[PDB]
């Protein structure tokens, strides 16, 4: 108890915050910054162009899950919305191909585009500030060559595979200068869109706009953003001998180790632990260990689809939460 | 001047405030849960909870009952101010750790 989620053999306990006045007679844990400000802490573990891993420490589950939900569903990104097919003679149906192109994640940074207003006419909805236009023109022809009979299609034909990288950025209007230094390319250019045999062709253009992951999955900027509580393993009594090695085997490789000399098993790295509670099934360690998770220590893993960096996605999520709270604050309350 | 975002449900409202339900459109568990947590962190608030009455509608009904010290509207406004402050602290700490790295 007391900030620790209890991991039992048949249940999970103590999962609610209990950090408010009215939990106990001491009406403590009133909200105040300069207490939360001094207790809250961030520990960044790693940073890539596509993945981040950081620890929001001493924050409540509601706020951490608010950030996670905003990242997954409410942070805007850019994806193809409308596909215009000039010619499609492949076996892949037009709508199937259009859906796939929509699922291709574009390496265009949002805040370069404005939100599309859907109240405008169709002739007046898409502008050089609202839309990215990607074309795709592939015609498959037999390779004018003669390799081994019935070989792999990469050399029997030409353009036998249509990749996402074949999607070409077409500047419209003033995008020729706005996007000159950051041309729009797929985040994953080896995405296989379609396979076509000689005589088949795919000609199209696609309009890409800002969207919300709640509106459609294709707009989500994170290939997964989630967290997990920090595992906590408390070895109540010394474990020694071969029993210590069995205890060690109950966890993933690096989680616990055997001290040299003392031959006692100690918790070496609880972060690497997945809570399979394997140890909680042996009745040998039944009272020699307590499994738990720190309820307010969140290990965020944010892996981005590719349009923006994971730390940017997280900051945008915090800014989105703050903005919606502030919008509500400014709004008047109507009877 | 948005006049549709947050409404006060009068049938659910008491006399002299201190107990009121607010309807917040285009809101869901994201804002509802954080707001409820922050509002419960207020000593005068005796009751706070939200509900999305139906998944089909983008609507959130948040209920606040207080003791006599303040009205539900004041507790709501304080909750929104405190949520903004909390997110500001989170922003500062995260941007500082990004810069340090």
């Amino acid at each position: 108890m007391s900030n620790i989620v209890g991991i039992e053999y048949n249940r999970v306990t103590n999962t609610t915050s209990t950090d408010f006045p009215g939990f106990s007679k001491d009406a403590e844990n009133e909200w105040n910054v300069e207490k939360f400000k001094k207790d809250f802490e961030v520990n960044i573990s790693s940073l890539d162009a596509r993945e981040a891993n950081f620890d929001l420490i001493n924050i409540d589950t509601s706020i951490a899950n608010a950030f996670r939900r905003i990242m997954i569903s409410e942070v805007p990104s850019v994806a193809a919305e409308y596909v215009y097919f000039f010619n499609n003679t492949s076996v892949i149906q037009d709508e199937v191909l259009a859906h796939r192109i929509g699922l291709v994640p574009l390496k265009v940074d949002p805040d370069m585009l404005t939100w599309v207003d859907s109240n405008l006419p169709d002739d007046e909805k898409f502008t050089d500030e609202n839309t990215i236009v990607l074309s795709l023109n592939v015609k498959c022809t037999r390779n004018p060559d003669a390799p081994k009979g019935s070989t792999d299609p990469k050399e029997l034909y030409n353009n036998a595979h249509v990749y996402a990288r074949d999607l070409k950025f077409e500047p419209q209007g003033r995008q020729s200068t706005t996007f000159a230094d950051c041309p729009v390319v797929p985040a994953d250019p080896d995405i296989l869109l379609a396979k076509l045999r000689p005589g088949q062709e795919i000609s199209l253009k696609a309009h890409c706009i800002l969207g919300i992951g709640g509106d459609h999955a294709k707009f989500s900027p994170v290939s997964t953003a989630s967290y997990r509580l920090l595992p906590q393993i408390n070895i109540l009594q010394p474990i020694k001998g071969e029993s210590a090695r069995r205890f060690q085997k109950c966890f993933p490789p690096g989680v616990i180790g055997i001290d040299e000399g003392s031959d006692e098993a100690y918790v070496k790295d609880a972060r690497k632990d997945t809570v399979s509670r394997e140890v909680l099934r042996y009745e040998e360690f039944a009272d020699k260990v307590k499994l738990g998770r720190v309820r307010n220590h969140f290990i965020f893993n944010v892996e981005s689809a590719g349009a923006m960096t994971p730390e940017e996605i997280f900051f945008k999520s915090v800014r989105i939460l703050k903005n919606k709270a502030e919008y509500l604050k400014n709004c008047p309350i109507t009877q | 001047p948005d006049r549709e975002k947050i409404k006060l449900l009068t049938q659910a409202t008491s006399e002299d405030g201190t107990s009121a339900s607010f309807q917040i459109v285009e809101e869901d568990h994201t804002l509802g849960n954080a707001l409820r947590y922050v509002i419960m962190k207020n000593p005068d608030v005796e009751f706070c909870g939200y509900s999305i009455p139906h998944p089909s509608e983008n609507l959130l009904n948040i209920r606040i009952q207080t003791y006599g010290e303040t009205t539900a509207v004041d507790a709501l406004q304080k909750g929104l101010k405190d949520l903004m402050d909390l997110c500001d602290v989170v922003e500062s700490k995260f941007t500082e750790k990004i810069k340090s790295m």
């Binding site: 585009l113 404005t114 | 340090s100």
Partner: peptide, 17 residues
């Protein structure tokens, strides 16, 4: 990495349409 991309860029997508 280690860049405050959000401070450098003036966001536009994040504001409500």
């Amino acid at each position: 990495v280690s860049r405050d991309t959000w401070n450098t860029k003036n966001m536009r997508s994040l504001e409500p349409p």
